[PDB]
């Protein structure tokens, strides 16, 4: 079967080729992108793979367009960007490699399809593990009956795509992937490359799809030490995820990464320690860590005072230096919720005296407004 490559592509497609043939090479566009071609998606960041010296084919890519390029040879890799593509150049490994040997170490059938850019079938989509048809049949499936054992990472990666496509795991996939979590392999596995996959899972829109899977597969138990589902936290994620849809929407300037919102409501019943640990491990930003620290020591209190706030200045007072995603959060309290609204939509919009004294008269001035 052929494709047609996008229009954003093709120029740097067909050159590719053309040198490829130069240096008596074979390239080919590779892995992701080629399923996200095939999803329909705007690609605006290509990889390619080559049989032969992919480092040398993308420094003379490079010197043509003028650009820099970076090579990295311990890998035979090299990046380089021209206008708005952002091109990756690596060399066919098996880890000389074919692209069939390149291509079956991969993940999942959908990412393990190629598109040829050579001069004499260019637009061939090289699809040797049922790639097409698993698209068709909206199935993740691995490679090989190992794959999970030799890459535990796998395990999550699976139900990040599951997730983000509405694809269920092929049935005997999920007969693996089940077993590689009952033989504890991914709880001993490397635990960078698994908080970096969870990393990748929090950025996804269906993430709250993407927790579903990783309940139903038992896998944050392995992996966040005394971590435990309950009813509670995921109806707390489904009434977060109408929260931030709403915040979203109306405030589309004021959009914050929510993913890290679902995170908080999932390690909040953690000890503090643990918690704060977990949050450092994962890197996340620093709104995020205070975020978290406040929801276990000031949150309580919080919520009681604004209950107890009878006018709209006590309620603009109390919220105003918080960030955004304690508002959202406290959201998620019934009786709190329009409070935030409020504060949201109206609240906050309202706009020889020297210094402080300039401010407290402005501030009483407010008063009178807001309670109005």
Not at 5 to 19: D, F, K
Not at 55 to 73: D, Q, S, W
Not at 346 to 354: A, D, F, N, T
Request: aromatic share 8%.
């Amino acid at each position: 079967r052929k494709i047609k490559v996008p229009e954003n592509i093709e120029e740097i497609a067909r050159e590719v080729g053309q040198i490829a043939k130069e240096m008596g090479l074979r390239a080919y566009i590779v892995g992701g992108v080629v399923r996200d071609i095939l999803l329909g998606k705007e690609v605006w960041d290509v990889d390619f793979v080559v049989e032969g010296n992919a480092i040398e084919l993308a420094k003379e890519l490079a010197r043509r367009h003028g650009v820099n390029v970076h090579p990295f040879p311990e890998f035979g890799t090299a990046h380089l960007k021209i206008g708005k593509l952002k091109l990756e150049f690596a060399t066919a490994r098996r880890e000389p490699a074919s692209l069939k040997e390149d291509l079956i170490r991969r993940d999942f059938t959908i990412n393990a399809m190629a598109i040829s850019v050579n001069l004499e079938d260019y637009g061939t989509l090289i699809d040797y593990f049922g790639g097409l048809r698993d698209l068709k049949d909206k199935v993740i499936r691995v490679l090989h009956p190992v794959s999970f054992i030799e890459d535990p990472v796998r395990i999550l990666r699976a139900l990040r795509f599951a997730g983000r496509l509405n694809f269920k795991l092929s049935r005997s996939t999920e007969k693996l992937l089940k077993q590689a979590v009952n033989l504890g392999l991914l709880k001993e596995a490397p635990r960078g490359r698994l908080i970096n996959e969870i990393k990748l899972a929090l950025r996804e829109d269906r993430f709250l799809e993407i927790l579903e899977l990783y309940r139903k597969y038992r896998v944050l138990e392995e992996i966040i030490e005394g971590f435990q589902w309950n009813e509670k936290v995921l109806q707390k994620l489904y009434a977060l995820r109408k929260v931030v849809d709403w915040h979203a929407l109306e405030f589309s300037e004021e959009r914050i990464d929510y993913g890290w919102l679902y995170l908080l409501i999932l390690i909040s019943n953690l000890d503090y320690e643990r918690g704060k640990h977990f949050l450092e491990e994962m890197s996340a930003p620093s709104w995020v860590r205070e975020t978290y620290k406040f929801m276990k020591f000031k949150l309580g209190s919080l919520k009681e005072e604004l209950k107890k706030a009878k006018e709209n200045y006590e309620v603009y007072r109390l919220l105003k230096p918080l960030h955004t995603s304690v508002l959202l959060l406290l959201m998620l309290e019934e009786e709190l919720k329009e409070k935030i609204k409020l504060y949201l939509e109206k609240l906050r919009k309202v706009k020889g005296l020297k210094g402080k004294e300039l401010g407290e008269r402005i501030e009483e001035l407010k008063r009178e407004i807001m309670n109005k």
